Amino acid sequence: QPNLYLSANAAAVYSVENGEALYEQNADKVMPIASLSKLMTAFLVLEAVDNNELSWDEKLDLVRLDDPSAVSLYAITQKRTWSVRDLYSAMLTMSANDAAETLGDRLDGADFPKEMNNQAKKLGMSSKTTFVSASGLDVDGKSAVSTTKDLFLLSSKLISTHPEVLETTSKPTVTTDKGAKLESTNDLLGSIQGLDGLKTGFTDEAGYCFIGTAERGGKRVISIVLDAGTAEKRFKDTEKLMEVGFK
């Protein structure tokens, strides 16, 4: 494998076709993942719509977060009622934590972390993965953790099961029906040709994290960057991983 000099502590890029690694650094090491948890929440929201168990047009009131300081749709808008569609978009574009928690609570109430971990097992993720909340916020001091290998398995399963997820994560801005603008945290959209996802994350413990995905000519790759040093460097790391991915 090539000799990359990444900011990330743990990183890898995989070809979706055979699931095989084109670069791996610390790909078995258990890492905090933070807002990357929202990809499991998206999967379960998309499953519930397909199962005739949830409506895109259902109106829900945002749940209140124990810390009013965290990134939240409510603080940006002063608007409490939102459709499932817009909460889903907010979760994936700007990483609104209260959107993610409102969706998880609607799906399974208090038991939603159990459902995330049940589904982690069904998707082939190892027992090193632990989800604690729909948003990736710590609960009872407990943090969501995984590995780049398990994160790949979740990502590729999300994309092959619900390809329409990329219709949301490929957009630099999502405008809801009523005109609210939801700006994506993925600053590489429009910079790498073929890049259409997937999810950012950051906490002090997790560092700056990003799962990316791009397809050129039938070939899809998924890159995972964990614990980069700055908000810009997880993207510079991704640029290097995409270059290896399409070599």
Ligand X SMILES: *C(=O)[C@@H](NC(=O)/C(=N/OC)c1ccco1)[C@@H]1NC(C(=O)O)=C(C)CS1
> Is 69 tagged catalytic?
no
Cis ω on the peptide bond leading into residue 241 (within 30° of 0)?
A: no
Burial class (CB in 10 A: 0-12, 13-18, 19+), 122: exposed
First to last CA, the chain: 11
By CB under 6 A, residue 203 contacts ligand X: yes
> Is 156 tagged catalytic?
no
- The nearer residue to ligand X, 25 or 41, going by C-beta atoms, is 41
Please pick, from the candidates 58, 79, 231, 232, the single residue that binds ligand X as defined by CB under 6 A. 231
Q: Which of residues 98-127 bind ligand X (CB under 6 A)?
A: none
To the question of whether residue 47 is assigned a binding role by annotation, the answer is yes
What tokens were used for 12?
């890898």
Please pick, from the candidates 25, 93, 146, 200, the single residue that binds ligand X as defined by CB under 6 A. 200
66-93: burial string, b at 16+ Cβ within 10 Å, e else: eeeeebbbbeeeeeeebbbbbbbbbbbb
Amino acid in the structure at residue 104: G
Please pick, from the candidates 7, 89, 93, 97, the single residue that binds ligand X as defined by CB under 6 A. 97
To the question of whether residue 199 is assigned a binding role by annotation, the answer is yes
Catalytic hit among 7, 37, 72, 95: 95
By CB under 6 A, residue 25 contacts ligand X: no
Catalytic hit among 7, 38, 135, 146: 38
The enclosing H or E element of 81 equals strand 81-83
> Is 133 tagged catalytic?
no
By CB under 6 A, residue 131 contacts ligand X: no
What tokens were used for 141?
């001091």
String of contacts with ligand X for each residue 53-92, x by CB under 6 A: -----------------xx---------------------
Q: CB neighbours of 111 closer than 8 A, spacing ≥ 6?
A: none
Sites of contact with ligand X (CB under 6 A): 34-35, 70-71, 95, 97, 136, 185, 200-203, 231
Would you name the residues annotated as active-site residues?
35, 38, 95
